[PDB]
Design a protein around this nucleic acid. Structure first.
Lengths: 224, 129, 88
RNA sequence: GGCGUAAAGCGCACGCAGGCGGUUUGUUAAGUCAGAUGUGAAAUCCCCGGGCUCAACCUGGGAACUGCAUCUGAUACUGGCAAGCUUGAGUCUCGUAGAGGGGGGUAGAAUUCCAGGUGUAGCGGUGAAAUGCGUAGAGAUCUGGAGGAAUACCGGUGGCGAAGGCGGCCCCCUGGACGAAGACUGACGCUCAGGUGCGAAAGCGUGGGGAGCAAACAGGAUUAGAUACCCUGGUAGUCCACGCCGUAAACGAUGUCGACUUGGAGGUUGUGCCCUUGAGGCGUGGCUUCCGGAGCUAACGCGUUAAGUCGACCGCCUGGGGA
């Protein structure tokens, strides 16, 4: 949140001037070497407001859903969402995880049944061909739905990295009225998000800074 | 060529409102300033200022409520190709009274309800809803 | 078109100053000079329609300037049309 | 209510009548507005009652008759008049790019033809053939000459032009566009029925010219037939001068003029700034190609060069045939 730590983390950096979105004009400070520079004076108050609303949602019995699938922010999202008893989607977002929850609930049930019969059940009726088949199905289903297995229903807030990369999740949350907290870069569309946090979403240290701040605020919210 | 500057002012307001512009600028005129006064006193624009002496430039500060346009519709009624004059008993009411109709009566430019209370008719400049 | 010296001469004899190059009299005189000069070119090049379009542009511009001058001040209009030899 | 594709933008432009017209002051009170007066026949329409036992019907009173004229005022807007102003529109200075137009000259490559040398049996053409040319020496090759037409490479969703269109090089005459900084005139403007002008190709008239190509035409093929596609020739024509014709899927199937509305990548042509580092970067105009946002659209798609939001004027459409 500290603008010095932000500027040292690489938050102010943006994409090239070609790929920019004109809707991101209020949050752009300028350009250097044909890449956009995000205005941190605009970034820190919006990030603080987003953190305040996230803390409210956490303290009011809420479920946060951390969404980010880029190879830069996958493991970071996993660590952040596990560090606060939350849920994450760090791999491919299945089209309809939220709007078609009544159908992916069955896949969650299947994943849970498979992992219980593998670990606690320990069928041992292997056949050495259906066993490896079931383990591969379990690993696919876990890489797809491993973060939201203990969610139960739809979350109350989405924290998205690279709002352009995750337009499907944002559109689903907007269809369901769930507030969206997205790290919107200079090339992304800030229309479908509620709490736009204009900052770099490609550098790894920037997303670790964002996720650490969000994890801290949601933990302090959990602990009231 | 420029044959209707009042319709041009209305079009500038409409296009600046649709583009979420903060303020719109245009060459000034007495009738433009009167219509801008009528719009400001009715609450459709925030403020207006006239800058310059030999070439006055009128600048209207557009108004938004919920990130939405305050001026939903603005149309030119009386135009150079067809002039529209109305008597006081047939003055139009826009949006069943929720909108205003800028009327140019012999006592200056005013709204349709002000011209009705004053017992006057005249040229229907525009409809603002 | 007209040379610089001929244009300067016309501006001087038809203008209220050596810099009054925009007066209606100066414009009409310059257009008349260009038309009279082009007359000889088109006597020899009767199939030059592309240049005759610019000639007719000059003619119509001079006509509109003369109409404006006659509507503005008829005395200067008469002085101009007698000094230039117009009125068909 | 419409005109990109469903019917509908004149092929393009100039322009008279007409329509509309930047901005300020004064004046008038023509349009406009307000009030009053006169009139707007009665019946009818409508409202409240009355009489027919009810109704139809009859009838009292009122409202209405949205109109016209006159008189008295108002002056915001439109109009008239007078004086202004510079931002629209033009003039001048200096340059820039361009297949813009008209006239004359010239250059090289190639096709064809004529004459000659070498040389010998084929050449040409096709899916295959044949018609055709060739022992009278073809085709091939070499040399010289004649004539006409068009300008390889450059060459490019490049440039110029109102449109149609414009392509070697040189000279002569000539139109438009754009840019820099100023000076000047001061609404002189936009559109335009009728009118006039330009208007691909084909076609027509007169006089030339005629290499190549090629309607018609002839022959050889193919075919059931083949008045065609294919082949061998070939006249008009294509070319030039001067007239006529006035039509095209004359297309962006998108009239002209002006204002406003997020962006990206290019092309072309000026101009300004900076140790010019560089064939550099950053601005600022003109024209132009592709994609795409809001918006619009029946959709396709258009999208700052709008088919978005508006204003002025014009042309056009009203089911398919007949036509």
């Amino acid at each position: 949140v500290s603008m010095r730590d932000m500027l040292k983390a690489g938050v102010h950096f943006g994409h090239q001037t070609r790929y920019w979105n004109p809707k991101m004009k209020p949050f752009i400070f300028g350009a250097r070497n044909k890449v956009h520079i995000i205005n941190l004076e605009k970034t820190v108050p919006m990030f603080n407001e987003a953190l305040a609303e996230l803390n409210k949602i956490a303290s009011r019995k809420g479920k946060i859903l951390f969404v980010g699938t880029k190879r830069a922010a996958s493991e970071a999202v996993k660590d952040a969402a596990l560090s606060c008893d939350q849920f994450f989607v760090n791999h491919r977002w299945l089209g309809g995880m939220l709007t078609n929850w009544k159908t992916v609930r069955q896949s969650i049930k299947r994943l849970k049944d498979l992992e219980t019969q593998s670990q606690d059940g320990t069928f041992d009726k292997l056949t050495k061909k259906e066993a490896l088949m079931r383990t591969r199905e379990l690993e696919k289903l876990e890489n797809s739905l491993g973060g939201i297995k203990d969610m139960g229903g739809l979350p109350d807030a989405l924290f998205v990295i690279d709002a352009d990369h995750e337009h499907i999740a944002i559109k689903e949350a907007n269809n369901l009225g769930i507030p969206v907290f997205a790290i919107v870069d200079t090339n992304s569309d800030p229309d479908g998000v509620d709490f736009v946090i204009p900052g770099n979403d490609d550098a790894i240290r920037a997303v670790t800074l964002y996720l650490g701040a969000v994890a801290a605020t949601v933990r302090e919210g959990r602990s009231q | 060529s420029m044959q209707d500057p009042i319709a041009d002012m209305l079009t500038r307001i409409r296009n600046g409102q649709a583009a979420n512009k903060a303020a719109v600028t245009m060459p000034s005129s007495k009738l433009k300033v009167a219509i801008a006064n009528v719009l400001k006193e009715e609450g459709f624009i925030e403020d207006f200022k006239v800058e310059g002496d030999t070439k006055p430039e009128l600048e209207l500060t557009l108004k938004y409520f919920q990130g939405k346009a305050v001026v939903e519709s603005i149309q030119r009624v009386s135009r150079p190709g067809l002039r529209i004059y109305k008597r006081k008993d047939e003055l139009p009411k826009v949006m069943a009274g929720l909108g205003i109709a800028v009327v140019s009566t012999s006592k200056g430019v005013m709204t349709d309800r002000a011209a009705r209370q004053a017992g006057l008719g005249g040229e229907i400049i525009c409809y603002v809803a | 078109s007209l040379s610089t010296e001929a244009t300067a001469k016309i501006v001087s004899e038809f203008g209220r100053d050596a810099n009054d190059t925009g007066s209606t009299e100066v414009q009409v005189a310059l257009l008349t000079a260009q038309i009279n000069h082009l007359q000889g070119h088109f006597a020899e090049h009767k199939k030059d329609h592309h240049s005759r379009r610019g000639l007719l542009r000059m003619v119509s511009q001079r006509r509109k300037l003369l109409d404006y001058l006659k509507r503005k001040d008829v005395a200067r209009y008469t002085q101009l049309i007698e000094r230039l030899g117009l009125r068909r």
